[model samples]
Target: DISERFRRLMRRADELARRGNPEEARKVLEEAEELMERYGSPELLESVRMLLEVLG
Candidate 1:
């Protein structure tokens, strides 16, 4: 369930980023990072980290 939720957030963030809303995307990813810290896989965390880096 967490992974599914994480994926949904990632998708939303991706959409925001593509729509020229990096700040919003970054905020979503920050929420994802919090979830990842608690219930995510390493790969999931890595992917979110990479996205955050790109947003920054």
Candidate 2:
């Protein structure tokens, strides 16, 4: 669930960014980060954190 959700969120982020909606993309990423806080495993959490850094 976590992995799939992460992938979905990143894909959505890419979509939003490509659509010139980075502010919304950022919001999407922020929401994903919160999901990470709740559902992410240690390794997966780190991956999300790194991805957040890039997205941020």
Candidate 3:
């Protein structure tokens, strides 16, 4: 469930980004990032971290 939610949040963040809301998108992505940090693979964590860097 967490993984699915994480994926949804990640996708929503992308949608927000595409809609030209980088700040809100980054905030949404922070949720996914935290989820990954708590319960995801190292690759997933790194992927989220890189996205955060680019979003910021």
Candidate 4:
């Protein structure tokens, strides 16, 4: 269920960002980033990087 969890985290991060909570979004993405580094694909990790950049 790693992919599912990763997707959920990404969705949550996006939601938090859309709701004007960049810090929370960033935190969520950081979690996703960690998960990705361990169990996700390279593409997913790249998406996380892009999202984090946007968060910043």
**Whole-model lDDT per candidate:** 0.90, 0.79, 0.87, 0.89
Q: TM-score of predicted model 3?
A: 0.90
Candidate 2 lDDT over residue span 20-51, tens digit each: 88788888888887887887767766765776
lDDT of 3 by residue, 1-56 (tens): 98889889988988999999999998987888888888888998898889889876
Stretches > 4 Å off in candidate 2: 42-56
RMSDs, each prediction?
Answer: 0.7, 2.2, 0.9, 0.7
For candidate 3, what is the lDDT? 0.87
Candidate 4: which stretches are off by over 4 Å?
none
Candidate 4 lDDT, 1-56, residue by residue in tens: 99889889989988999999999999999999999898888998998999898766
Residue 27 in model 3: lDDT: 92
Clashing residue pairs in candidate 3 (N, C-alpha, C atoms within 3 angstroms): none
Candidate 4 TM-score, true structure as reference: 0.94
Query: What is the lDDT, from 0 to 100, of the residue 33 in candidate 1?
Result: 95
Per-residue lDDT of 27 in model 1:
93
Colliding pairs, model 4: none
**Top candidate by lDDT:** 1
lDDT of 2: 0.79
TM-scores for all predictions: 0.92, 0.67, 0.90, 0.94
Q: Please report the TM-score between candidate 2 and the true structure.
A: 0.67
**Residue lDDT tens for model 1, 1-56:** 88788889989998999999999999999999999889878998998999898777
Error of 2 at 21 (Å): 0.3
